[PDB]
Design a binder for this molecule. Sequence first.
Ligand SMILES: *[C@@H]1O[C@H](CO)[C@@H](O[C@@H]2O[C@H](CO)[C@@H](O[C@@H]3O[C@H](CO)[C@@H](O)[C@H](O)[C@@H]3O)[C@H](O)[C@H]2NC(C)=O)[C@H](O)[C@H]1NC(C)=O
Ligand SMILES: *[C@@H]1O[C@H](CO)[C@@H](O)[C@H](O)[C@H]1NC(C)=O
Lengths: 49, 49, 49
Amino acid sequence: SETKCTLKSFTVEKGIYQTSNFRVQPTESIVRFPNITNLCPFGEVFNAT
Amino acid sequence: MYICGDSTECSNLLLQYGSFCTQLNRALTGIAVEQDKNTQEVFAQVKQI
Amino acid sequence: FNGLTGTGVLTESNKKFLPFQQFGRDIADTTDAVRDPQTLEILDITPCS
Ligand SMILES: *[C@@H]1O[C@H](CO)[C@@H](O[C@@H]2O[C@H](CO)[C@@H](O[C@@H]3O[C@H](CO)[C@@H](O)[C@H](O)[C@@H]3O)[C@H](O)[C@H]2NC(C)=O)[C@H](O)[C@H]1NC(C)=O
Ligand SMILES: *[C@@H]1O[C@H](CO)[C@@H](O)[C@H](O)[C@H]1NC(C)=O
């Protein structure tokens, strides 16, 4: 069926056909940041007088 | 994979350009089959070993 | 990895990243490895699909 969709036809002749990828690759997500933990100075930028 | 490598948003955007990847794949497949035919015509003249 | 967003399989690599070197690129200027900020081991990237 992947081959039939690649050729946009319901009948397929004899031979080798390079098929396009109709499949679902991704599974999950991973986020790896540095451990640095200290708030940025923002009260002296926006709340300054 | 070349234009919008494993990116579904870019693949959906590329789908708006019509059958452009199909044309390039067809041309390259024709070129490869032509190379095989060139080798066969040059060397496989007589089929008696 | 530290803002290096990317979809693809991460696998342990045998590269010899120098201590200052962080990302690791290829000919096409596409990131094919990362040095993990948490563990200094490096991980190469293979696209899915
Ligand atoms: C500059 O000073 C202002 C003073 O208005 C700060 O705004 C205050 O920010 C705090 C912390 O985010 C807010 O408290 C939080 O508010 C809501 C209540 O529904 C909720 O998210 C939390 O439970 C918490 O109480 C506080 O309400 C807010 N005050 C006002 C009047 O909006 C501001 O954070 C300071 N810094 C900057 C960078 O603007
Ligand atoms: C943060 O601490 C972890 C251990 O908890 C360490 O492996 C990692 O290298 C640190 N990340 C930094 C300093 O960015």
